[PDB]
Enzyme design. Structure first.
Site, PDB file in Angstrom:
ATOM      1  N   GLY A   1       0.760  -1.271  -0.043  1.00 49.01           N
ATOM      2  CA  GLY A   1       0.129   0.010  -0.112  1.00 49.01           C
ATOM      3  C   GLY A   1       0.841   1.266  -0.031  1.00 49.01           C
TER       4      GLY A   1
ATOM      5  CG  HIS B   1       0.195   6.962   5.163  1.00 51.67           C
ATOM      6  ND1 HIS B   1       1.592   7.366   6.094  1.00 51.67           N
ATOM      7  CD2 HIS B   1       0.626   5.659   5.035  1.00 51.67           C
ATOM      8  CE1 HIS B   1       2.366   6.300   6.252  1.00 51.67           C
ATOM      9  NE2 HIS B   1       1.759   5.250   5.560  1.00 51.67           N
TER      10      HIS B   1
ATOM     11  CD  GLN C   1       3.316   5.646   2.804  1.00 51.47           C
ATOM     12  OE1 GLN C   1       2.398   5.270   1.962  1.00 51.47           O
ATOM     13  NE2 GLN C   1       4.334   5.071   3.186  1.00 51.47           N
TER      14      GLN C   1
ATOM     15  CB  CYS D   1       5.093   2.181   7.595  1.00 47.42           C
ATOM     16  SG  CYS D   1       4.522   3.762   6.629  1.00 47.42           S
ATOM     17  CG  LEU D   2       6.372   1.070   1.548  1.00 47.14           C
ATOM     18  CD1 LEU D   2       5.902   1.255   0.191  1.00 47.14           C
ATOM     19  CD2 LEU D   2       7.330  -0.195   1.707  1.00 47.14           C
TER      20      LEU D   2
ATOM     21  CG  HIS E   1      -0.894   1.497   7.013  1.00 44.45           C
ATOM     22  ND1 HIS E   1      -0.275   1.203   8.208  1.00 44.45           N
ATOM     23  CD2 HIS E   1      -0.149   2.487   6.453  1.00 44.45           C
ATOM     24  CE1 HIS E   1       1.184   1.547   7.929  1.00 44.45           C
ATOM     25  NE2 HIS E   1       0.976   2.359   6.841  1.00 44.45           N
ATOM     26  CD  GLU E   2      -1.235   2.563   2.665  1.00 41.31           C
ATOM     27  OE1 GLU E   2      -0.395   1.666   2.975  1.00 41.31           O
ATOM     28  OE2 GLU E   2      -0.693   3.825   2.467  1.00 41.31           O
TER      29      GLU E   2
END
Ligand code: NI
Ligand code: NI
Ligand code: NI
Ligand code: ZN
Length: 137
Positions: free
Chosen positions: A42, A131, A47, A85-86, A127-128
């Site tokens: 995701g 963000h 991000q 998380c990226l 989660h997304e």
């Protein structure tokens, strides 16, 4: 694109609603490419420094984009969701998540979409969306 560093201010900023009908096709392509290059499932606009309410996903029951994603229904209570998380390589956090959500928004062609998700995919979505509100694990 680049996955912003863990200390980027964009990670805490609020992403702006995408004006209805705005051409987001190239942005979604770039975001999808960034997500896959980083080995993610995701990714949210913040991000990659894009303060627009766009998410991309490659989750078990949903693969694609959502423009202006909103949670319209969810189960009561919370369940265990260990997440990375990226934007925070190497970190896993045990999050509380809704076990089921319905997410609504638009696809890249501005067709309305609805996603009924449970477990991993529901966690992905929450989660997304977090963000986009400047909320991180
Ligand atoms: Ni790049
Ligand atoms: Ni921070
Ligand atoms: Ni509620
Ligand atoms: Zn993340």
């Amino acid at each position: 694109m680049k996955i912003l560093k863990d200390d980027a201010p964009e990670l805490h900023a609020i992403a702006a609603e995408v004006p209805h009908g705005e051409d987001v096709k190239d942005l979604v392509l770039d975001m999808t490419a960034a997500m896959t290059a980083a080995g993610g499932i995701g990714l949210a606009g913040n991000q990659v420094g894009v303060l627009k309410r766009i998410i991309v996903l490659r989750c078990p029951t949903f693969k694609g984009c959502v423009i202006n994603p909103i949670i319209t229904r969810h189960t009561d209570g919370h369940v265990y969701s260990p997440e990375g998380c990226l934007s925070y390589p190497g970190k896993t956090v045990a999050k509380k998540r809704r076990n089921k959500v319905v997410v609504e928004g638009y696809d890249m062609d501005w067709q309305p979409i609805t996603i009924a998700a449970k477990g991993l995919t529901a966690f992905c979505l929450q989660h997304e969306i977090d963000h986009l509100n400047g909320v991180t694990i």
